[PDB]
């Protein structure tokens, strides 16, 4: 029956106004908007005849009890329509308005602000203050000769004589700049502190220009004056004004939808092409700071909420960027040449480096344009309403392909130069520009290709589109992007935040550092949770000590343990030995919660019947969160788990190569089932024999596991499931608490960034290798140690860093570490083996492989050191769909 207007109660049933279009307001704009209608239609009831009864003077009940502001808004205004009347005459305003020519410091200006505010509450003065301000801003500050003209038109009116005389001179220090600064400060203060000036600005006034009709366009002419657009202080306030006068202009249109009296009554302004272009021009101004940029973005969004604006804004942005992108192509090309001929000692011509460093460069302009498009098609759209396909279209019409290719060519030169100014950061605003073109993209399953090899070094991104630019580019400039993050690691918390979506590119060391600070360093002030273990009881002496304690406090509290095994709590190797060997007892076969992996005794594994342990649930959860503490806190708990374990730790589908070192004969048969020897000759029903103390019930792996048979057609799925079961469902649920203990310690969303070998080298201290020990504790199959590809293959080994070589070792040794003595104790599946470089020509130019089941390795004879290097790097790094899967 009633509708609340700022908190009051009026029976709208007995009122003309429809609330459905008012409720949309946040109960704030409703107050003033209602008052506008109240007073206008009350005057209509006063003068215009033939009125209906719904209004009824909106009742005395809603005049005497309606908020006093509205009462005074109607009554006092009604009493003053023809006692709180205008304080000063019109000429007073002129005399007062001369203050703006009295250039003064701050503080002194405040008195003017409160006085001018108090001069409101009077349609006479308010409509006089605004006009005078617009007069000064639009017809006085252009020449300092027009300033004198308006000053004489102002001072003359202060005396009542609107006749002009006396040629009054200015203080001779007053500059259009100072008048503008003071006037805009005052205007902003009024618009912000007091309402009812917004509506005056937007609403038509009726004394085709549109200026005399709409006050707002007086401020839009300020956006084409070099006097204004060359100052970062006047632009800031001139944009803070429009960010408010535009917000309201948007809300009204949205709320109306149906009944739009305001659109039909105030005649809400209509924006043409040029008007929106003036607003957009701000982002291309040299004076556009970060603040001016945010306010301009808000103004753009608000105007976009209007009709016929979105398309205009998009078209203008596209044209702007296309205009810009021609200069960037030229500026980059000159740089690409210069950087290639800088040799040593010399530096880039400062003029060519000044077009990439100054805050008013084009790269910043391109970044601002692209950030504006992102804002437009992202700001408050819920991530599902986004027409990212349409968004990409916009980026495709910019023909920025050349710029991206020039950028790639430019970056390649830095990677291959000895320069002082190399400092690719100068192109950082350009690199981040590419990361706005792709931030909202899908970038999913385009990474999942692999197989490809050393097809880069000539890629042109001229027409690669937007969905096929991220990965090809980042992959290409991996080294440069990793060297840029190693100096400013905050790039990952900002411009390079998008790189989280291509973790394959982030090297290990940067990955580790990003991981720790984000997660670990956040938690400090850790309390004490000591535990007193024995040096032999160790595992149980710790576990049973807590055995049910809070999963949060345990990790968020320091472990100052005072263990009885020896003397000491920390500070001297006593606490780290606890961490060091605790998991050594978790593997303890007596507990039977782990298994020396069938391949290697050195390597452990949860054990197919890991739950067989009388106490397994609280013995794995221990293991899980134990790793988390060490990983979070520090040190290592050396194990070897298994590749699928890490994959399961990262919740990712597993490979078959795992079976190679998990059950050799099983793999030789499972591989035999997939290929090698399968013509339904393997036969045997589907599903996997489900051991129960020797009782094989061959559970239906899939619903109809036994129902299906292992035939040539179904061989692939059968083996996939068997390996999956033997690798995951063999331990199925028992690992779950192992995952909860860890995942509670180290959240999954900050482990997904790592991958397999990286996670291991994190968990286990990164190893170091001896090349010479990789020359004697080795085996050269069908290949001389200096035949051709083997030699510069050793060169490739040399050129790799620790993180890469450890993978190379882990690409032949299964899951890392060195068996001591210099590889001589090559602990194969039987327990003794030797590194084996099997030629295995097999399309000698294709990617290599290996079988750590035998400490084996495949070396397709390539021809080129570069191609071999690339294939080797891809393979060792690769963990999915290459070395992983099949």
What are the C-alpha distances in Å from 452 to residues 95, 125, 789, 857, 880?
79, 75, 20, 20, 13
User: How many other C-beta atoms can be found within 10 angstroms of the C-beta atom of residue 572?
Assistant: 10
- For residues 778 and 130, give the distance between their C-alpha atoms in angstroms, rounded to a whole number: 89
Please tell me whether residue 709 adopts helix, strand or coil conformation. strand
What are the C-alpha distances in Å from 775 to residues 599, 693, 770, 796, 834?
24, 46, 9, 14, 11
Residues classed as catalytic: 853
Is 301 within 8 Å of 375 (Cβ atoms)? Answer: yes
HEC-encoded secondary structure of 283-309: HHCCCCCHHHHHHHHHHHHHHHHCCCC
| Token couple for 446 | 């385009």
- For residues 72 and 236, give the distance between their C-alpha atoms in angstroms, rounded to a whole number: 35
Q: Reported resolution in A?
A: 3.1
- Owner of token pair 């021009």: 281
- For residues 559 and 579, give the distance between their C-alpha atoms in angstroms, rounded to a whole number: 10
Is 365 within 8 Å of 429 (Cβ atoms)? Answer: no
What are the C-alpha distances in Å from 365 to residues 265, 399, 692, 784?
40, 16, 69, 58
* Closest alpha carbon to 372 in 476, 294, 264, 450: 294
- For residues 136 and 878, give the distance between their C-alpha atoms in angstroms, rounded to a whole number: 68
Is 244 within 8 Å of 201 (Cβ atoms)? Answer: no
- Owner of token pair 């990439």: 356
Whole-number CA gyration radius for the chain: 38
Is 878 within 8 Å of 453 (Cβ atoms)? Answer: no
Beta strands 856-858 and 836-838: pairing type?
A: parallel
Q: Where do runs of H (alpha helix) occur along 520-640?
A: 538-546, 551-556, 574-586, 617-633
Chain-centroid distance of CA 660 in Å reads 40
Is 844 within 8 Å of 862 (Cβ atoms)? Answer: yes
- For residues 625 and 27, give the distance between their C-alpha atoms in angstroms, rounded to a whole number: 51
- For residues 110 and 471, give the distance between their C-alpha atoms in angstroms, rounded to a whole number: 56
Is 702 within 8 Å of 635 (Cβ atoms)? Answer: no
Instruction: Please state at what angle helix 123-139 crosses helix 146-158, rounded to 10 degrees.
Output: 160
Beta-carbon contacts of residue 43 (< 8 Å; ≥ 6 apart): 81
Q: Where do runs of H (alpha helix) occur along 800-878?
A: 802-810, 865-877
- For residues 242 and 223, give the distance between their C-alpha atoms in angstroms, rounded to a whole number: 11
- For residues 470 and 441, give the distance between their C-alpha atoms in angstroms, rounded to a whole number: 9
User: How many other C-beta atoms can be found within 10 angstroms of the C-beta atom of residue 510?
Assistant: 20
Q: Backbone breaks in the chain (C–N > 2.5 Å) follow which residues?
A: 82, 207
- For residues 147 and 256, give the distance between their C-alpha atoms in angstroms, rounded to a whole number: 42
**What φ, ψ does residue 847 adopt, rounded to 5°?**
-60, 150
What are the C-alpha distances in Å from 834 to residues 290, 582, 831, 837?
62, 31, 10, 10
Beta-carbon contacts of residue 20 (< 8 Å; ≥ 6 apart): none
Is 859 within 8 Å of 783 (Cβ atoms)? Answer: yes
| Token couple for 665 | 């004969």
Chain-centroid distance of CA 418 in Å reads 33
Beta bridge partners of 558: 528
- The technique by which this structure was obtained is cryo-EM
- For residues 310 and 316, give the distance between their C-alpha atoms in angstroms, rounded to a whole number: 10
- For residues 104 and 380, give the distance between their C-alpha atoms in angstroms, rounded to a whole number: 43
Beta bridge partners of 528: 558
Please tell me whether residue 857 adopts helix, strand or coil conformation. strand
Is 745 within 8 Å of 555 (Cβ atoms)? Answer: yes
- For residues 453 and 455, give the distance between their C-alpha atoms in angstroms, rounded to a whole number: 6
- For residues 718 and 715, give the distance between their C-alpha atoms in angstroms, rounded to a whole number: 5
- For residues 545 and 531, give the distance between their C-alpha atoms in angstroms, rounded to a whole number: 7
| Token couple for 29 | 């704009």
H helix and E strand count, the chain: 38, 2
Is 197 within 8 Å of 126 (Cβ atoms)? Answer: yes
- Owner of token pair 């890392």: 816
Beta-carbon contacts of residue 840 (< 8 Å; ≥ 6 apart): 849, 858, 859, 860
Is 424 within 8 Å of 484 (Cβ atoms)? Answer: yes
């Amino acid at each position: 029956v009633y509708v609340t207007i700022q908190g009051s109660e009026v029976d709208i049933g007995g009122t003309d106004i429809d609330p459905e279009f008012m409720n949309a307001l946040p109960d704030d704009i409703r107050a003033d908007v209602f008052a506008q209608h109240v007073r206008e239609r009350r005057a209509e009831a006063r003068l215009n005849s033939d009125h209906n009864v719904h209004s009824r003077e909106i009742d005395s009940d809603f005049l005497e009890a309606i908020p006093e502001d509205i009462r005074e808004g109607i009554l006092d205004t009604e009493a003053e329509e023809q006692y709180f009347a205008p304080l000063i005459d019109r000429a007073g305003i002129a005399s007062l308005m001369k203050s703006v020519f009295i250039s003064k410091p701050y503080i002194q200006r405040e008195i003017y602000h409160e006085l001018f505010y108090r001069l409101c509450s009077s349609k006479q003065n308010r409509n006089d203050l605004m006009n005078t301000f617009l007069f000064i801003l639009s017809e006085g500050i252009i020449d300092q000769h027009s300033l004198e003209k308006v000053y004489n038109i102002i001072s003359s009116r202060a005396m009542g004589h609107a006749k002009t005389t006396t040629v009054r001179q200015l203080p001779s220090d007053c500059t259009p700049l100072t008048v503008a600064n003071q006037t805009i400060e005052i205007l902003q203060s009024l618009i912000d502190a007091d309402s009812r000036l917004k509506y005056f600005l937007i609403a038509e006034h009726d004394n085709p220009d549109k200026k005399l009709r709409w006050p707002l366009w007086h401020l839009f002419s300020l956006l084409d004056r070099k006097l204004i657009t060359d100052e970062s202080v006047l632009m800031d306030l001139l944009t803070r004004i429009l960010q408010v006068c535009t917000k309201t202009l948007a809300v009204l249109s949205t709320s109306s939808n149906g009944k739009e009296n305001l659109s039909k009554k105030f005649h809400l302004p209509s924006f043409d092409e040029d008007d929106l272009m003036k607003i957009l021009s701000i982002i291309m101004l040299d004076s556009c700071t970060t603040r001016v940029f945010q306010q301009t973005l808000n103004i753009i969004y608000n105007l976009s909420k209007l009709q016929g604006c979105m398309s205009i804004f998009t078209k203008h942005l596209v044209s702007l960027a296309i205009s810009i992108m021609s200069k960037l192509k030229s500026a980059l090309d000159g740089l690409s040449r210069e950087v290639g001929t800088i040799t040593t000692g010399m530096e880039i011509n400062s003029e060519l480096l000044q077009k990439f460093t100054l805050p008013s460069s084009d790269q910043a302009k391109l970044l601002k344009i692209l950030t504006t498009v992102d804002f437009l098609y992202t700001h408050k759209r819920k991530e599902e309403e986004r027409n990212v396909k349409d968004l990409q279209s916009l980026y495709d019409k910019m023909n920025g392909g050349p710029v991206w290719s020039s950028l790639s060519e430019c970056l390649s030169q830095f990677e291959k130069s000895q320069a002082i100014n190399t400092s690719a950061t100068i192109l950082l605003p350009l690199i981040e520009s590419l990361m706005v073109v792709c931030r909202r993209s899908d970038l999913s399953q385009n990474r999942n290709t692999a197989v490809k090899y050393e097809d880069a070094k000539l890629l042109d991104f001229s027409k690669t589109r937007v969905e096929n630019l991220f990965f090809p580019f980042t992959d290409a400039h991996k080294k440069l992007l990793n060297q840029m993050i190693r100096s400013n690691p905050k790039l990952m918390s900002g411009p390079f935040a998008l790189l989280v979506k291509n973790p394959k590119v982030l090297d290990f060391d940067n990955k580790r550092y990003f991981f720790n600070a984000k997660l670990k360093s956040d938690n400090q002030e850790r309390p004490k949770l000591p535990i007193t273990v024995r040096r032999e009881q160790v595992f149980l002496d710790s576990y049973r000590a807590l055995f049910f304690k809070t999963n949060d406090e345990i990790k968020n509290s320091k472990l100052e343990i005072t263990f009885k095994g020896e003397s000491g709590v920390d500070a001297g190797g006593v606490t780290r030995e606890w961490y060091q060997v605790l998991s050594r007892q978790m593997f303890n076969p007596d507990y039977a919660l782990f298994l020396p992996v069938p391949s290697d005794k050195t390597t452990f594994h949860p054990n197919r019947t890991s739950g067989i342990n009388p106490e397994h649930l609280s013995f794995f959860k221990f293991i899980g969160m134990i790793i988390g503490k060490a990983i979070r806190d520090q040190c290592f708990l050396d194990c070897h788990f298994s590749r699928e374990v890490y994959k399961n730790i990262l919740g990712r589908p597993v490979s078959l190569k795992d079976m190679e070192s998990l059950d050799p004969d099983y793999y030789k048969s499972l591989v035999w089932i997939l290929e090698n020897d399968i013509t339904d000759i393997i036969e045997e029903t589907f599903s996997v024999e489900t051991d129960d103390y020797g009782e094989h019930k061959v559970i239906n792996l899939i619903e109809g596991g036994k129902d299906i048979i292992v035939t040539e057609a179904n061989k692939q799925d059968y083996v996939k499931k068997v390996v999956e079961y033997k690798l995951q469902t063999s331990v199925k649920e028992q690992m779950d608490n192992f995952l909860v203990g860890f995942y509670a310690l180290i959240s999954k969303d900050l482990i997904t960034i790592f991958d397999e070998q990286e996670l291991e080298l994190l968990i286990s201290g990164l190893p170091d290798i001896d090349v010479d020990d990789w020359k004697n504790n080795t085996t050269y199959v069908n290949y001389t140690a200096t035949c051709k590809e083997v030699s510069y293959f050793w060169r490739a080994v040399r050129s790799f860093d620790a993180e890469e070589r450890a993978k190379l070792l882990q690409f032949v040794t299964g899951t890392s570490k060195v068996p001591l003595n210099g590889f001589k104790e090559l602990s194969g599946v039987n327990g003794v083996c030797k590194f084996s470089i099997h030629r295995d020509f097999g399309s000698s130019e294709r990617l290599p492989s290996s079988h750590t089941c035998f400490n084996q390795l495949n070396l397709p004879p390539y021809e080129s050191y570069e191609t071999l290097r690339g294939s080797l790097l891809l393979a060792i790094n690769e963990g999915h769909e290459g070395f992983g899967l099949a």
